[PDB]
């Protein structure tokens, strides 16, 4: 047997959480779990620890699963302290601990979150490689651990086919928060369409007032608003326009009891691996204040086992503190004065986005064409990226199917149109003909390109 304790703090529904796990048949395994519920109006740190280790003597508890209605930036970091003091695993998703980066101990036994902040930057790169968006500016305050993060997303070079395009990182000291003599002297780089901004909600509430004071409003949007840092979509102040493009996994958790059952399966699978390879169960600690050394040395095989475990097609190999490779991620849509919701989908390499256009705070044309010799050449897409590098067009061919893969178009007239777009102002909606009857008039009507001309479809040809 092993001991798994669940703790919920804050108002929640322990019945759906109870019922979800007690139908999970963990037989066909060598070890079986042992659940223990503990509720919740008590909220001091000392009561929490002195409650956990208050229990921790009667039952053999191998660990604690805590909750999503707390603020874990504060108390929770000390878990790696107590974890290395107790050698017991602690997993989870939960609360204020949204992508916490710290210098936790080597002997701590705990993994948490989902993707890393650089894996998050990698999906942010896959986002900018969907619409070929290129960063003109980054602005980050002096956190204790920001500048290494940006200097790693900077050092993650991207090979050409693409603009690599940094032009400005900006570290500003927010101690001396003189928005007149510091944030004004550090601007003027905002004449550019893309600005990255990695901060917290409160200092964004300050700096969005400064950005409104200078005139960083119109321009439309200001670009990266990382959700996982300042995660409260309900009570965010909004002193700017829309915002919230970005990514967390924080779909309102359709999967939270499934996350609990998956984590229980992870722990039980690791213990099953120990029984298959060594078989011996390390006895859990039995005290906190008394004889606290408690069979002092323990096999470091569990830290190696916590990483080598995977659950069927779902859980990833759990190596970097709790920073996985391909957990499910979501994308959010875009206003804070009207609490807009999720608009994207991400799964394990792939991105699906159902807006297709950038809002801006009529020069949009549909354009219907035809494949021929070297005026409009149609070629297939790259098998690694989907998009097209030198061809720069969707050409959304119908089969109807305006979701058929956006075949690349090359040739002479496209090179003419790409100059005429910058000449006045344009926006494409490029697609191919379907009936294949370009330039034909039959009895009554026209077909092909002239057929989509006579049908008044907001066109060029």
């Amino acid at each position, epitope marked *: 047997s092993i001991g798994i304790a669940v703790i919920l703090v804050g108002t929640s529904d322990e019945v759906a959480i109870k019922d979800a796990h*007690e139908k999970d048949d963990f037989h066909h395994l060598s070890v*079986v779990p042992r659940v223990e519920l503990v509720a919740m109006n008590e909220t001091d740190p000392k009561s929490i620890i002195t409650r956990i280790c208050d229990l921790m003597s009667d039952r053999k508890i191998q660990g604690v699963v805590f909750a999503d209605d707390t603020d874990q930036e504060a108390i929770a970091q000390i878990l790696d302290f107590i974890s290395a003091q107790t050698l017991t695993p602690i997993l989870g998703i939960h609360g204020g601990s949204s992508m916490i980066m710290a210098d936790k101990d080597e002997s701590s036994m705990f993994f948490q979150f989902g993707p890393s902040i650089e894996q998050q930057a990698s999906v942010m790169l896959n986002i900018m490689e969907e619409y070929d968006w290129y960063i003109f500016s980054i602005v980050t305050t002096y956190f204790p651990g920001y500048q290494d993060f940006v200097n790693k997303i900077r050092s993650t070079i991207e090979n050409s086919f693409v603009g690599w395009e940094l032009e400005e990182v900006l570290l500003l000291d927010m101690s001396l928060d003189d928005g007149d003599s510091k944030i004004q002297n550090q601007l003027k780089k905002l004449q550019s369409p893309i600005i990255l901004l990695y901060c917290t909600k409160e200092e964004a509430t300050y700096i969005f007032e400064v950005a409104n004071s200078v005139g960083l409003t119109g321009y439309g949007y200001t670009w990266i608003v990382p959700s996982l840092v300042a995660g409260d979509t309900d009570t965010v102040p909004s002193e700017f326009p829309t915002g919230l493009i970005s990514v967390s996994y924080d779909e309102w958790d359709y999967g939270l009891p499934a996350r609990v059952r998956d984590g229980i399966a992870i722990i039980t699978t690791a213990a099953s691996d120990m029984l298959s390879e060594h078989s011996f169960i390390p006895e859990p600690k039995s005290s906190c204040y008394n004889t606290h050394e408690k069979r002092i040395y323990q096999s470091n095989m569990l830290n190696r086992y916590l990483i080598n475990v995977t659950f069927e097609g779902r859980d990833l190999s759990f190596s970097e503190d709790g920073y996985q490779m391909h957990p499910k991620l979501v994308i959010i849509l875009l206003n804070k004065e009207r609490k807009w919701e999720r608009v994207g989908k991400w799964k394990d390499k792939s991105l699906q986005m159902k807006y297709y256009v950038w809002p801006r705070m009529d020069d949009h044309l549909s354009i219907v064409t035809l494949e021929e010799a070297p005026f409009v050449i149609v070629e297939s897409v790259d098998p690694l990226s989907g998009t097209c590098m030198r061809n720069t067009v969707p050409c959304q061919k119908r089969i109807e199917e305006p979701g058929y893969i956006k075949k690349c178009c090359k040739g002479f007239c496209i090179d003419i149109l790409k100059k005429i777009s910058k000449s006045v102002k344009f926006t494409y909606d490029l697609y191919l003909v379907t009936n294949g009857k370009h330039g034909k008039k039959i009895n009554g009507t026209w077909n092909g390109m002239i057929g989509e001309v006579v049908m008044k479809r907001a066109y060029m040809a």
Partner: antibody
Amino acid sequence: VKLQESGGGLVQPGGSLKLSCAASTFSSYTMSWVRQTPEKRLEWVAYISNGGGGTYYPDTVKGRFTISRDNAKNTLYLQMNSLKEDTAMYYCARPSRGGSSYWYFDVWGAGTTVTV
Amino acid sequence: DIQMTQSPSSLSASLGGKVTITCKASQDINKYIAWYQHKPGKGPRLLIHYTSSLQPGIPSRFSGSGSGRDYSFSISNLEPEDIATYYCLQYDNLYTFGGGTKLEIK
């Protein structure tokens, strides 16, 4: 929820009598049952989990006994072979706090006998 | 598997006496204790949890103390509707049982 036993007998000397205890939620609830000595000892008989797995016994009746359960009809199934020196009473007991683990029942059955 | 042995064989006491029966298992139980009482042919009645926690409906006539693997359970001030026989349970591994004793009144 209440527990009611059935299938009482030891009509063949050295035979096999599949006894049961029906219930009226028992699907997340394990099962283990009890015979009584002439010294009245509440000795254990068998072990199943709630999900049919975890098929075990104590050292008294090992080697002869075939064990299963069905959580749809809320019944246990085990054939008695080595009670042939006892005039035992058997009851069913459903341990509290559910799960594939075990806890302290007040949820016991009714109590029926097996006489040779 | 772990096996238990209760002791000894007798509950010879008068009306309102004092008796004590010992849980003795082969392995460490970490105060995994229960206590049951029944008439011949009636059925068990729960007494005792982890910290000798009595049951609602069970009077304060029953107390106990002990730890680790050895536990003592004392009955006093006994009214003869409790003509019974007392039994101890451990559940470190799945369930555990020993002999136990029966009650007679002199």
